[PDB]
Design a binder for this molecule. Structure first.
Ligand SMILES: NC(=O)c1ccc[n+]([C@@H]2O[C@H](COP(=O)([O-])OP(=O)(O)OC[C@H]3O[C@@H](n4cnc5c(N)ncnc54)[C@H](OP(=O)(O)O)[C@@H]3O)[C@@H](O)[C@H]2O)c1
Ligand SMILES: NC(=O)c1ccc(F)cc1OCC(=O)O
Length: 316
């Protein structure tokens, strides 16, 4: 298991990164410091997570301390839905750069295919409670992303939560200049994504798996929901390998040639989650984990099901 995967821009991306959604701002600085101290070289960020400044403090300290060189880090962020308008994309990227205290991102993603009305609110609502869309075509948003590469703000651009038809739309864009390097999508044993993953990989697009542990801290969790970390079948595979269930859940996407970004703010777990380069799941283990698919989503963007570009009506 090599530690990085080659992207279609010629750069190498670490296959394990630290997630930061829900990481409290008073804890995420230490989380990122610990992560870098124990070997992480890839941090997954987003403006909408509201903690990029605090992530940046950690990155900057570790650069200043010479624990890691900038060229060795792979920092990812994402353009929020309210910045799809072509004239807003650069400023959104620049704000993220300023908060993260960087002069470039390694990868910048369109966070969701759904554009929203610009403004202070991340989910602008009409008086009846529906999200208010933007009329900016995603192809125009993509062109604006391409400009970021050409201005040196980002090394690579990509997409997130795009279904296969939406990926195809980008790939078929008239005058396409840079292909998406990555599609970041939810992926774990309850949402295995075989169809979308094969499609992306066949086009040379690297897939990053988010919520690999099933996001037990997701805000809308219900007590009766399925639980990957508590699934006795997954626990059994872990016990066989003398690893934790989380470690199996992280190793699983790695062996599918995916990048994976487990989130933690707990120092012991941050370290545990990185200790996944010392064992191998068998083909049987892999197919067994795949068999647990139930098409269950942590992130269904339920408030936007009426949005024209809602990604999850299509089969994949
Ligand atoms: N592109 C998108 O739309 C999108 C959507 C969702 C997520 N993401 C990205 O993917 C990252 C990961 O997804 P996620 O945050 O939804 O959930 P996740 O990584 O599947 O799970 C995070 C949860 O698992 C716990 N945890 C972590 N390691 C553990 C371990 N070894 N043992 C037991 N529990 C453990 C964490 O607790 P503690 O933190 O308390 O230790 C936290 O409650 C996000 O943070 C974000 O960076 C992207
Ligand atoms: N998708 C959401 O509803 C969401 C909203 C705000 C936020 F900070 C995170 C979120 O989910 C995770 C994501 O979209 O990366």
């Amino acid at each position: 298991m090599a530690s990085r995967i080659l992207l279609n821009n010629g750069a190498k991306m670490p296959i394990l990164g630290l997630g930061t959604w829900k990481s409290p701002p008073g804890q995420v600085t230490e989380a990122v410091k610990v992560a870098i101290d124990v070997g992480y070289r890839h941090i997954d960020c987003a403006h909408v997570y509201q903690n990029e400044n605090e992530v940046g403090v950690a990155i900057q300290e570790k650069l200043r301390e010479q624990v890691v060189k900038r060229e060795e880090l792979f920092i990812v962020s994402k353009l929020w839905c309210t910045y799809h308008e072509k004239g807003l994309v650069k400023g959104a990227c620049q704000k993220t750069l300023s908060d993260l205290k960087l002069d470039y991102l390694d990868l910048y993603l369109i966070h969701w295919p759904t554009g929203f009305k610009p403004g202070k609110e991340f989910f602008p609502l009409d008086e009846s409670g529906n999200v208010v869309p933007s009329d900016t075509n995603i192809l125009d948003t993509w062109a604006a992303m391409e400009e970021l590469v050409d201005e040196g703000l980002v090394k690579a651009i990509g997409i997130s939560n795009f279904n296969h038809l939406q990926v195809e739309m980008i790939l078929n864009k008239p005058g396409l200049k840079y292909k998406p390097a990555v599609n970041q999508i939810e992926c774990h044993p309850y949402l295995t994504q075989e169809k979308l993953i094969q499609y992306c990989q066949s086009k040379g697009i690297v897939v990053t798996a988010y919520s690999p542990l099933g996001s037990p801290d997701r805000p809308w969790a219900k007590p009766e929901d399925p639980s990957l970390l508590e699934d006795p079948r997954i626990k059994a595979i872990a016990a066989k390998h003398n690893k934790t269930t989380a470690q199996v859940l992280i190793r699983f996407p790695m062996q599918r040639n995916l990048v994976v970004i487990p989130k933690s703010v707990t120092p012991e777990r941050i370290a545990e989650n990185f200790k996944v380069f010392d064992f191998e799941l068998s083909s049987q283990d892999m197919t067994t984990l795949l068999s647990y698919n139930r098409n269950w989503r942590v992130c269904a963007l339920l408030s936007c099901t009426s949005h024209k570009d809602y990604p999850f009506h299509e089969e994949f």
